[PDB]
Amino acid sequence: RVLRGSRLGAVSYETDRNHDLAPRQIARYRTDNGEEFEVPFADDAEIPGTWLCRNGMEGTLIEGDLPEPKKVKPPRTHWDMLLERRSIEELEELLKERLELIRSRRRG
Amino acid sequence: DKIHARSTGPYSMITQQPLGGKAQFGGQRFGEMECWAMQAYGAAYTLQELLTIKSDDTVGRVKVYEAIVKGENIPEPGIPESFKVLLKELQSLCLNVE
Amino acid sequence: PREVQIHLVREVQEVYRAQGVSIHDKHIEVIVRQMLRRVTIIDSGSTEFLPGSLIDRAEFEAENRRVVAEGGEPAAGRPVLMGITKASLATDSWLSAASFQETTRVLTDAAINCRSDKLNGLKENVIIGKLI
Amino acid sequence: GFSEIMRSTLEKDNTVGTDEALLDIYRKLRPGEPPTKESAQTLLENLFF
Amino acid sequence: IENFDIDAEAESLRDVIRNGKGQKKLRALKRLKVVAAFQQSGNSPMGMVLDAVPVIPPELRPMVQLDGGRFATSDLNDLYRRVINRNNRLKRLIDLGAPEIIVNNEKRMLQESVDALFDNGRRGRPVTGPGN
Amino acid sequence: SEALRQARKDAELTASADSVRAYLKQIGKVALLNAEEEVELAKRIEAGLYATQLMTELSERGEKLPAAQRRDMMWICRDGDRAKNHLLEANLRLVVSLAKRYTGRGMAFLDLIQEGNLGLIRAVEKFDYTKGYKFSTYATWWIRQAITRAMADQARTIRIPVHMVEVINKLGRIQRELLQDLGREPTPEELAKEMDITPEKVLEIQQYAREPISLDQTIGDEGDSQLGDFIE
Amino acid sequence: GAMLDVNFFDELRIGLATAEDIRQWSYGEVKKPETINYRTLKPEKDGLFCEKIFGPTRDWECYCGKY
Numbered sequence: 078r079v080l081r082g083s084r085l086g087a088v089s090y091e092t093d094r095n096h097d098l099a100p101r102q103i104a105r106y107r108t109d110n111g112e113e114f115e116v117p118f119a120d121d122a123e124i125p126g127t128w129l130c131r132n133g134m135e136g137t138l139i140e141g142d143l144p145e146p147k148k149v150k151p152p153r154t155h156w157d158m159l160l161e162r163r164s165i166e167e168l169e170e171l172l173k174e175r176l177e178l179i180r181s182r183r184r185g
Numbered sequence: 186d187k188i189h190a191r192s193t194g195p196y197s198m199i200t201q202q203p204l205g206g207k208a209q210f211g212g213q214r215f216g217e218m219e220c221w222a223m224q225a226y227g228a229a230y231t232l233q234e235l236l237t238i239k240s241d242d243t244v245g246r247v248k249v250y251e252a253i254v255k256g257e258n259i260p261e262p263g264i265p266e267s268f269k270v271l272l273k274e275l276q277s278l279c280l281n282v283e
Numbered sequence: 284p285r286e287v288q289i290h291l292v293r294e295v296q297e298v299y300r301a302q303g304v305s306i307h308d309k310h311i312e313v314i315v316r317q318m319l320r321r322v323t324i325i326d327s328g329s330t331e332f333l334p335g336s337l338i339d340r341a342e343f344e345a346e347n348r349r350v351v352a353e354g355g356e357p358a359a360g361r362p363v364l365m366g367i368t369k370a371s372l373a374t375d376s377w378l379s380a381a382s383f384q385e386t387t388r389v390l391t392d393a394a395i396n397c398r399s400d401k402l403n404g405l406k407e408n409v410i411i412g413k414l415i
Numbered sequence: 416g417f418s419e420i421m422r423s424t425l426e427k428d429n430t431v432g433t434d435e436a437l438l439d440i441y442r443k444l445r446p447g448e449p450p451t452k453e454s455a456q457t458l459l460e461n462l463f464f
Numbered sequence: 465i466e467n468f469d470i471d472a473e474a475e476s477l478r479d480v481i482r483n484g485k486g487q488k489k490l491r492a493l494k495r496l497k498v499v500a501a502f503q504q505s506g507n508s509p510m511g512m513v514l515d516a517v518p519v520i521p522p523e524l525r526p527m528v529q530l531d532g533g534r535f536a537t538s539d540l541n542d543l544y545r546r547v548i549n550r551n552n553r554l555k556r557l558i559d560l561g562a563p564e565i566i567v568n569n570e571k572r573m574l575q576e577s578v579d580a581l582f583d584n585g586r587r588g589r590p591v592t593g594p595g596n
Numbered sequence: 597s598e599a600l601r602q603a604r605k606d607a608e609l610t611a612s613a614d615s616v617r618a619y620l621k622q623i624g625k626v627a628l629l630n631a632e633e634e635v636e637l638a639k640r641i642e643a644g645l646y647a648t649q650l651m652t653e654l655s656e657r658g659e660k661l662p663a664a665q666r667r668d669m670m671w672i673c674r675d676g677d678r679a680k681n682h683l684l685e686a687n688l689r690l691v692v693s694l695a696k697r698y699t700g701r702g703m704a705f706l707d708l709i710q711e712g713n714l715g716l717i718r719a720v721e722k723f724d725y726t727k728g729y730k731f732s733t734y735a736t737w738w739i740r741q742a743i744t745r746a747m748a749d750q751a752r753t754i755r756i757p758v759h760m761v762e763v764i765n766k767l768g769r770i771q772r773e774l775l776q777d778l779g780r781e782p783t784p785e786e787l788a789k790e791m792d793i794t795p796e797k798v799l800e801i802q803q804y805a806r807e808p809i810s811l812d813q814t815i816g817d818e819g820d821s822q823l824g825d826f827i828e
Numbered sequence: 829g830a831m832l833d834v835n836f837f838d839e840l841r842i843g844l845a846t847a848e849d850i851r852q853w854s855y856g857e858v859k860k861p862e863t864i865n866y867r868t869l870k871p872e873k874d875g876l877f878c879e880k881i882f883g884p885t886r887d888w889e890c891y892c893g894k895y
């Protein structure tokens with residue numbers, strides 16, 4: 078009869094010890110627009126120099142640890158889409174025909 | 186078909202109220218005019234119990250149960266859950282509710 | 284204003300006489316005192332008022348004592364009777380006023396005016412669960 | 416024919432002409448588009464007849 | 465709103481309600497109400513425009529599954545999804561470069577989405593779903 | 597005719613409460629084109645792209661730029677942009693014509709239209725004129741692909757990757773066809789034979805297919821009775 | 829004025845929220861219209877239920893399950 082539900086998460090019942098914790102470092106992070114952010118990592122924890130902060134952007138670490146700059150590639154350009162079907166000499170002949178077209182526009 | 190009581194049974198999902206209805210254990214709807222009458226008696230404390238620690242104070246309810254079965258004094262009612270729901274909605278409507 | 288209380292009380296009580304219902308008039312007289320809480324204001328005078336503004340008689344009296352010295356131009360006041368659904372809505376506690384009508388227009392001015400509620404009525408302390 | 420109603424409405428027509436009243440009914444029916452007179456005679460027959 | 469000295473129109477409206485006549489005076493009064501309201505508190509009309517939209521915490525708009533895995537949304541997730549999608553699409557078209565009819569149309573769609581997210585049916589037709 | 601024109605121009609600009617109608621009236625202002633117009637505009641597009649390529653290799657000091665040559669190659673570079681924007685503004689009506697048939701299924705109409713505009717951008721990017729066809733035929737594939745991609749992505753409250761949406765649509769097409777031509781309701785084992793898969797996979801796909809219901813419907817007989825309250 | 833809920837205020841000041849206050853309240857820009865993964869039933873990354881943004885669904889449990 079009664080329809081029941083469960084939000085898919087675990088609920089335990091323990092003591093909130095504010096005294097007996099795992100000790101922990103705090104890493105300061107600096108974003109692109111100079112925003113400071115102090116992420117609490119654990120003690121036994123590798124600190125990534127990059128971190129998506131609370132700002133909604135990427136915030137690098139406040140030290141000069143030199144993370145990897147790009148490790149990426151450009152997606153594609155309209156010129157790449159153009160070059161997949163046409164020749165460089167084809168586009169250069171079109172460039173010369175539009176040069177003559179602007180010549181007829183200008184002084185012809 | 187009608188006799189229907191509840192000490193502590195199931196609760197609602199979105200709100201934290203005790204889920205009424207005889208299909209459940211089911212509370213009683215402590216409506217508006219009952220709030221009026223218990224205002225008119227001037228009984229502030231019983232109204233505070235009925236609107237916080239029998240209804241929506243989530244951490245208050247287990248402390249009430251613990252104080253009863255330990256036989257200790259009933260603790261102070263905390264903030265009701267529905268008021269915090271109202272506060273979060275009003276903060277979510279871009280209104281700084283200081 | 285005196286007779287209009289005596290007009291309101293006896294006329295309403297005349298109905299409950301007709302049904303054989305004993306209502307002591309001081310239960311009526313609580314309501315009539317609540318209706319005439321506010322007077323109307325037509326002059327700005329000297330201290331920030333508007334024509335047709337409905338403000339409390341005692342508060343209109345309150346500002347005048349501080350303003351008869353340093354610019355003694357009081358607001359031209361007139362006691363007015365305002366109705367039940369209207370006198371309820373023209374309260375200072377916007378949180379109490381939120382439970383009345385189209386709650387947007389209760390609130391959009393309230394955040395504009397930054398009107399801090401003081402939780403002093405027993406209606407609002409019910410909502411936050413304070414000891415009323 | 417035998418009423419002040421028919422006299423007052425015959426004088427309070429303020430839209431005289433057969434197809435004028437056709438396109439008047441049609442432009443009251445459409446509003447938001449150019450009309451056409453021949454559809455005004457038949458959409459009447461469509462929507463009721 | 466950025467290039468708006470509010471105090472200038474405040475003093476202008478002060479002068480108009482001081483010296484004016486007719487409904488222009490009462491109209492300047494009705495404007496002077498909200499002008500002095502913004503001038504009085506520590507608010508600013510910069511917040512009347514919106515630059516970032518907050519999200520209500522997700523337990524208040526939960527997605528609970530039932531027996532047989534029947535999920536139950538909370539009808540705000542669809543509005544939030546529409547606003548999120550329109551903002552992402554607008555960002556993509558802005559970084560791409562598009563004709564301004566497309567860009568302004570996407571901005572208008574974003575605006576209508578935010579407006580319906582706050583109050584569905586306040587402007588235009590109300591956004592409905594299954595069963596209308 | 598001036599009376600019907602006057603009444604139509606009076607009744608045409610009343611409210612404009614519909615943003616879809618406003619967008620329709622907005623995009624109806626640019627004129628259509630033909631094949632040689634497409635050829636000319638695409639020539640301008642490729643010329644401006646080669647112009648900005650020459651500018652890109654000219655960004656380092658490969659050549660001393662003359663004033664007239666710098667300004668006319670920049671003229672060509674912006675000219676290709678003008679031609680491309682002209683083409684997109686021409687074919688927005690084609691986008692409307694395609695999007696008008698895939699409504700009534702989850703998504704919003706202007707959102708479908710804008711995703712079709714993105715697909716139209718990709719089509720006019722990857723469009724060739726030396727192949728010598730109408731632009732609309734080639735653009736139709738890209739626009740309908742972007743439309744189906746958007747309807748697979750952003751039309752459900754839970755995101756489903758597009759292949760599972762495709763097999764859900766294939767199952768639904770097969771199921772409607774089987775309920776029609778079989779006359780009665782199909783068995784899932786017969787459906788699993790039909791799509792050459794396992795019945796347990798059919799059951800998992802049907803389990804994925806169930807869209808969630810909202811909690812904000814008046815499910816009880818009372819209008820104030822909320823469905824979200826009656827959940828243990 | 830403290831929101832730390834000690835059950836005494838005597839004051840409640842509504843007001844307009846600036847864009848700075850809106851970005852001050854939050855815990856990261858939610859940036860994807862993905863609510864719950866259809867297979868694992870766990871909240872998606874940076875979507876409308878993302879545990880990095882809001883918090884964990886399992887008590888004192890990090891999402892990968894390390895701590």
Ligand SMILES: [Zn+2]
Nearest residue numbers: 890891892893
């Ligand atoms: Zn984890």
